[PDB]
Write a protein that holds these residues in place. Structure first.
Motif, PDB file in Angstrom:
ATOM      1  N   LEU A 153       0.868  -1.173   0.000  1.00 42.33           N
ATOM      2  CA  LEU A 153       0.000   0.000   0.000  1.00 42.33           C
ATOM      3  C   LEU A 153       0.907   1.226   0.000  1.00 42.33           C
ATOM      4  O   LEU A 153       1.406   1.640   1.049  1.00 42.33           O
ATOM      5  CB  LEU A 153      -0.917  -0.020   1.219  1.00 42.33           C
ATOM      6  CG  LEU A 153      -2.426   0.146   1.045  1.00 42.33           C
ATOM      7  CD1 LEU A 153      -2.858  -0.292  -0.328  1.00 42.33           C
ATOM      8  CD2 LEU A 153      -3.160  -0.658   2.108  1.00 42.33           C
ATOM      9  N   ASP A 154       1.109   1.814  -1.177  1.00 41.50           N
ATOM     10  CA  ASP A 154       1.925   3.016  -1.331  1.00 41.50           C
ATOM     11  C   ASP A 154       1.026   4.241  -1.209  1.00 41.50           C
ATOM     12  O   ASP A 154       0.244   4.534  -2.117  1.00 41.50           O
ATOM     13  CB  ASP A 154       2.657   2.995  -2.673  1.00 41.50           C
ATOM     14  CG  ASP A 154       3.607   4.167  -2.847  1.00 41.50           C
ATOM     15  OD1 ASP A 154       3.798   4.943  -1.884  1.00 41.50           O
ATOM     16  OD2 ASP A 154       4.169   4.314  -3.952  1.00 41.50           O
ATOM     17  N   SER A 155       1.132   4.955  -0.089  1.00 38.01           N
ATOM     18  CA  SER A 155       0.315   6.144   0.161  1.00 38.01           C
ATOM     19  C   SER A 155       1.176   7.388  -0.042  1.00 38.01           C
ATOM     20  O   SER A 155       1.740   7.938   0.903  1.00 38.01           O
ATOM     21  CB  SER A 155      -0.281   6.104   1.564  1.00 38.01           C
ATOM     22  OG  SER A 155       0.736   6.122   2.550  1.00 38.01           O
ATOM     23  N   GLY A 156       1.271   7.832  -1.292  1.00 37.10           N
ATOM     24  CA  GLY A 156       1.937   9.075  -1.614  1.00 37.10           C
ATOM     25  C   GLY A 156       1.077  10.286  -1.297  1.00 37.10           C
ATOM     26  O   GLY A 156       0.051  10.208  -0.618  1.00 37.10           O
ATOM     27  N   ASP A 157       1.515  11.434  -1.815  1.00 33.12           N
ATOM     28  CA  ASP A 157       0.781  12.679  -1.631  1.00 33.12           C
ATOM     29  C   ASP A 157      -0.179  12.983  -2.774  1.00 33.12           C
ATOM     30  O   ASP A 157      -0.941  13.951  -2.679  1.00 33.12           O
ATOM     31  CB  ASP A 157       1.763  13.848  -1.466  1.00 33.12           C
ATOM     32  CG  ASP A 157       1.165  15.014  -0.708  1.00 33.12           C
ATOM     33  OD1 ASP A 157       0.052  14.866  -0.163  1.00 33.12           O
ATOM     34  OD2 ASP A 157       1.809  16.082  -0.655  1.00 33.12           O
ATOM     35  N   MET A 299       2.672  -1.668   4.284  1.00 36.20           N
ATOM     36  CA  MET A 299       2.245  -0.305   4.015  1.00 36.20           C
ATOM     37  C   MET A 299       3.473   0.598   3.958  1.00 36.20           C
ATOM     38  O   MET A 299       4.400   0.445   4.760  1.00 36.20           O
ATOM     39  CB  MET A 299       1.234   0.141   5.080  1.00 36.20           C
ATOM     40  CG  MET A 299       1.232   1.602   5.401  1.00 36.20           C
ATOM     41  SD  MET A 299       0.490   2.543   4.050  1.00 36.20           S
ATOM     42  CE  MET A 299      -0.799   3.443   4.909  1.00 36.20           C
ATOM     43  N   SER A 300       3.483   1.537   3.012  1.00 36.06           N
ATOM     44  CA  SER A 300       4.630   2.410   2.796  1.00 36.06           C
ATOM     45  C   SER A 300       4.156   3.811   2.435  1.00 36.06           C
ATOM     46  O   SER A 300       3.095   3.988   1.828  1.00 36.06           O
ATOM     47  CB  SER A 300       5.549   1.864   1.691  1.00 36.06           C
ATOM     48  OG  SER A 300       6.708   2.667   1.541  1.00 36.06           O
ATOM     49  N   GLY A 301       4.952   4.801   2.817  1.00 34.40           N
ATOM     50  CA  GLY A 301       4.686   6.194   2.509  1.00 34.40           C
ATOM     51  C   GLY A 301       4.919   7.086   3.716  1.00 34.40           C
ATOM     52  O   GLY A 301       5.027   6.632   4.854  1.00 34.40           O
ATOM     53  N   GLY A 302       5.042   8.391   3.453  1.00 34.24           N
ATOM     54  CA  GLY A 302       5.249   9.336   4.541  1.00 34.24           C
ATOM     55  C   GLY A 302       4.069   9.410   5.490  1.00 34.24           C
ATOM     56  O   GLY A 302       4.246   9.552   6.707  1.00 34.24           O
TER      57      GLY A 302
HETATM   58 MG   LIG Z   1       4.168   6.839  -0.962  1.00 32.11          MG
END
Ligand SMILES: [Mg+2]
Ligand SMILES: Nc1ncnc2c1ncn2[C@@H]1O[C@H](COP(=O)(O)OP(=O)(O)O)[C@@H](O)[C@H]1O
Ligand SMILES: Nc1ncnc2c1ncn2[C@@H]1O[C@H](COP(=O)(O)OP(=O)(O)O)[C@@H](O)[C@H]1O
Ligand SMILES: Nc1ncnc2c1ncn2[C@@H]1O[C@H](COP(=O)(O)OP(=O)(O)O)[C@@H](O)[C@H]1O
Ligand SMILES: [Mg+2]
Ligand SMILES: [Mg+2]
Lengths: 375, 65, 65, 375, 375
Positions: A153-157, A299-302
């Motif tokens: 789960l890539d949660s970018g902006d 899960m990954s992302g800032g």
């Molecule tokens: Mg991300």
């Protein structure tokens, strides 16, 4: 610059740019992807009077600049903006010349291939990088986790992507992109704060409210019950000290803001919560391995620096999926750098220079060679 | 007349007191970044332990399942 | 005298300047105790995480046995 | 008072209060939202010596009173001021008692929910209205137009709102508020007139210059070309006769004042012109209906009495959007009363009394009931 | 005259004219802006019989001359008066010819554009200055402080201006002019002294009472409590020795005169105290930098020689604004010359001669060229 000709590792994440040298543990130059431009024209003299402002300079000069995003949800506005910010990163921030170091870059999932072709062509013409490689951030986060099985789960902006990968193989048929991201979070929080009496439109307050999201926000365990008990909630209600000095108090909103991703019907999306998007993604593929996907979700992302995603994630998936096998999430601290770490990992091994995209291949086959050289 | 003389004295004394206060405040400042740096040191060490503990826990749990 | 006016002015103003550098230093000192507070908070939370780590390790250990 | 127990219809528009009875075509008591207070203390006797002055009384007594705004851009200063002005409207101007008539009120778009809860609570305690309903002015202007499809540009005196509504459904996800309004117009005109040699600060001259905006102002078809030809422009330059009798001549300023909303960079806003705000609003929603939004745009507010908004609107939208379908604006004369007309329309039908907010519901659930009774 | 062709630096401040050469630390010829004319006609012979009297000559001849102000609050009465006083300054006081030295001038904030066009045209025709530049006194005081961030309170003798400038950028949208200045101070003190038994109308006593304001006046820390303790106040009551020799005693009036700027309701202004005008100015702009404005406020003008403005300023702003961040005012001694110092600073650097307004540009485009050459 190191005496050795080691490669450049640059993660142009959708929201943050993190650049450095190969063999390093963390990127050296990390800055948000905001770009500031003079709000008015030039009449004064003696200082300033510079067009592009990037990095911490623009962060300090946020008030005087129109703050614009050269990329939003992957879409590219102006390649000149990337040209300038890459110049700044390489020379003013990394103090490196790209002539003597090949570059490993990471791109947003399904960053367009046509977008790939134009960006690679302008890059090769404008810059003098010896060799090239670009990869999807999904496998980079996988490498950071160091486990070939799992759903990322890539949660970018700009976008949130769900990508399943079993035993280190990509599953594009079960990969999806959702238009909910930091932008939406800030927007929704903006309208709620407007209903709280504070109505701002400019980007400085956007950064202030995303900072508030970084600090105080909750992920509600039970939603309507927590607003019911948050009616008064003197202890549960939490306050923030804005840099001007005013004390701004927020209660249920702390856990009513991230809930928009989980409950998109608040501001009108046909797609259900991101847990449904992980669920459908899982069932699209063969039944048998689905249990492993349940047990190996990453899960990954800032954004992941916030609390509450893990408990909500597991509980809802267990509600949706049978509760025989135990589901557990893994998320190393400071995972927003993890992608860049994986880039260093790519440069670690001696097989990586077998498929550097050299200058002469691009000169022979144009940009089209990447269509055969990366995939 | 004489009051201005007292003025010379009180103004100089207050100035020297301000100087000493500034010097002491700067010294305490520097000491505070020293303590912040040492705290950062043990925090980083303990985090570096925590990462490997997290990895071993995940692998052990998978083996249990 | 006008010279006296200027004398008191430079002396008093330098006094206020020195005091004010003292308090700006003191503000940096306050932000330093702040940084120390967040670092100690993170260290304590990390210690809690490590102790929970060891407890989870033991429990899964004789679960595996 | 009519023998029948018909409802009260009151539009508390941001800049004007228009109140009357249901079933009437136009509001009976219409007054600006300025409130005057004694500039000095009391020593004289025999007359006057009254604190609050509202309506035409304050208009006649503008010079002697500090002129204050109980509401600005939706923000509420002092509820006592609304208490007094509503007393004046109901008894001295409408000659009606709110005991026997339910009230339909209109509120500024996206007004604070806390503002609604406090205003409703003070209202119910202070007054004895039998029943209540409050609605957004956007759907009221829609009812006045009588067409369920369109984007409403509500240009009040504190905020300008763009709200899209397709087939009589609100689209809050594509609704925006801009802090440009009459106040800004007066300010900008004040500074330009200061550069013309006339520098005033007090509110009487504020009303004089807004009257000038009502009478003489243009909306430039082409901006810099019209100042270039307005260099001399003996015929194009226009004059006004101020009530003191002096002749004040203004040229390009006539069309350089409303242009600021279209060109916010004149006095420093990150947001572009209001046409950009309608454009973004349109694209935020699904592509297909956007053409209908282009063809069904409506504009509402007292400002709309000025010329030039329609031609500028269509030309710029056609410049921004493809020119295949024909874009046409609709704006009935005297549309600042239109909202109140829609209120009467609401009381026209016999289903409206199914959802009157009665006294006992508020007594049971407090103000919180409105959270479930209106939306 | 210096052998070098260095520029002229002239501050025509609203109340004082300070002129000299570039590269100098202080202006050489400094005189008040009063102009005396013969009160009667000519019958005598052998001496005098001269119309215009300016500078210290008029100061010595105050009694025999009608004392008139060629400028009041920026408004220009008679350009011939400026012609004569500039002749006097250049030749009788500066002993310089404007043929060989370009002039840098400072103008009152928000001065009329028509005023600028007429004054520049009469200047260029009447005089033979080689080159020109005119600037707002706000940025000049900023330059004297040498810090690009802050809000400038320019307290001239005709107007008080509040102008915010962040990181060396002007904010006209948050700039205001208040009609309270030295004139008002003298007037109010005149009426109070009339209530003390001394009633004068002529300008000589105007200068006497402004001298009293320079010497004895207080700024009350607490107003009504200080008149309550000033009832008797034998020690607190202070006396002055008027040049005729009479001893005039004043008590609470010392701190009841400057208070009127802070409390305008004493003589009937809708606008509140100047601290409110700085407060509103601050909030008009984005929230975030407001704290810096609080901490970087600067005050400039001849009035600033009085005590009490600093303590009152900070205390009231801290009362109005949250008291988290520390507010401190900066004001260098003898700051009424500071503007002129900044003019010298402008001539210090070698880029300043890139935008001198030469004779041929004005001959080509008329006065209108300044509309494009300064801003
Ligand atoms: Mg991300
Ligand atoms: N230290 C932090 N704590 C919490 N949230 C953060 C932090 N740093 C960045 N973020 C959030 O992460 C977002 C950027 O995501 P990013 O890491 O660039 O996505 P990607 O992994 O696709 O590059 C920002 O909008 C910001 O709100
Ligand atoms: N007859 C008129 N002609 C032109 N402008 C007007 C007229 N009447 C009112 N206005 C303008 O309309 C503004 C008030 O807007 P208003 O109609 O109250 O907004 P809303 O529709 O939100 O209530 C005032 O500032 C005034 O300048
Ligand atoms: N030495 C002084 N002490 C106190 N007040 C002074 C002094 N010199 C001038 N002033 C006051 O300053 C006023 C003139 O202000 P000025 O400095 O001309 O404003 P500006 O800064 O806009 O040019 C005069 O009315 C006078 O009362
Ligand atoms: Mg309106
Ligand atoms: Mg001044």
């Amino acid at each position: 610059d190191e005496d050795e000709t080691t490669a450049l590792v640059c993660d142009n994440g959708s929201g943050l740019v993190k650049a450095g040298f190969a063999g390093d543990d963390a990127p050296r130059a990390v800055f948000p992807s905001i770009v500031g431009r003079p709000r008015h024209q030039g009449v004064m003299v003696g200082m300033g009077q510079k067009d592009s402002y990037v990095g911490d300079e623009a962060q300090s000069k946020r008030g005087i600049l129109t703050l614009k995003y050269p990329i939003e949800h992957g879409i590219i506005t102006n390649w000149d903006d990337m040209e300038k910010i890459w110049h700044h990163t390489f020379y003013n921030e990394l103090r490196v010349a790209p002539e003597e170091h090949p570059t490993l870059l990471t791109e947003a999932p399904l960053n367009p291939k046509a977008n790939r072709e134009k960006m690679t062509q302008i890059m090769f013409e404008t810059f003098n990088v010896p060799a090239m490689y670009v990869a999807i951030q999904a496998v980079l986060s996988l490498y950071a986790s160091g486990r070939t099985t799992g759903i990322v789960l890539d949660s970018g902006d700009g976008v949130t992507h769900n990508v399943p990968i079993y035993e280190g193989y990509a599953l594009p048929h079960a990969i999806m992109r959702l238009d909910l991201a930091g932008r939406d979070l800030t927007d929704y929080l903006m309208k709620i704060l407007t209903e709280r009496g504070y109505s701002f439109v400019t980007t400085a307050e956007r950064e202030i409210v995303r900072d508030i999201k970084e600090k105080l926000c909750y992920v509600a365990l039970d939603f309507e019950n927590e607003m019911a008990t948050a009616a008064s909630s003197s202890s549960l209600e939490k306050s923030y000290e804005l840099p001007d000095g005013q004390v701004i108090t927020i209660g249920n909103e702390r856990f009513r803001c991230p809930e928009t991703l989980f409950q998109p019907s608040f501001i009108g999306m046909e797609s259900a919560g991101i847990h449904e998007t992980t669920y459908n993604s899982i069932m699209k593929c063969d039944i048998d391995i689905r249990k492993d996907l349940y047990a190996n979700n990453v899960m990954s992302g800032g954004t992941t620096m916030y609390p509450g995603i893990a408990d909500r994630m597991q509980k809802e998936i267990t509600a949706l999926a049978p509760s025989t096998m135990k589901i557990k999430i893994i998320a190393p601290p400071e995972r927003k750098y993890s992608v860049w770490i994986g880039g260093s990992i790519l440069a670690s091994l001696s097989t990586f220079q077998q498929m550097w995209i050299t200058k002469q291949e691009y000169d022979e086959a144009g940009p089209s060679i990447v269509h055969r050289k990366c995939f | 007349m004489d009051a201005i003389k007292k003025k010379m004295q009180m103004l100089k004394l207050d100035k020297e007191n301000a100087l000493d206060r500034a010097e002491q405040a700067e010294a305490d400042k520097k000491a505070a970044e020293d303590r912040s740096k040492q705290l950062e040191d043990e925090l980083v060490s303990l985090q570096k332990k925590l990462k490997g503990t997290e990895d071993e826990l995940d692998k052990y749990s998978e083996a249990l399942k």
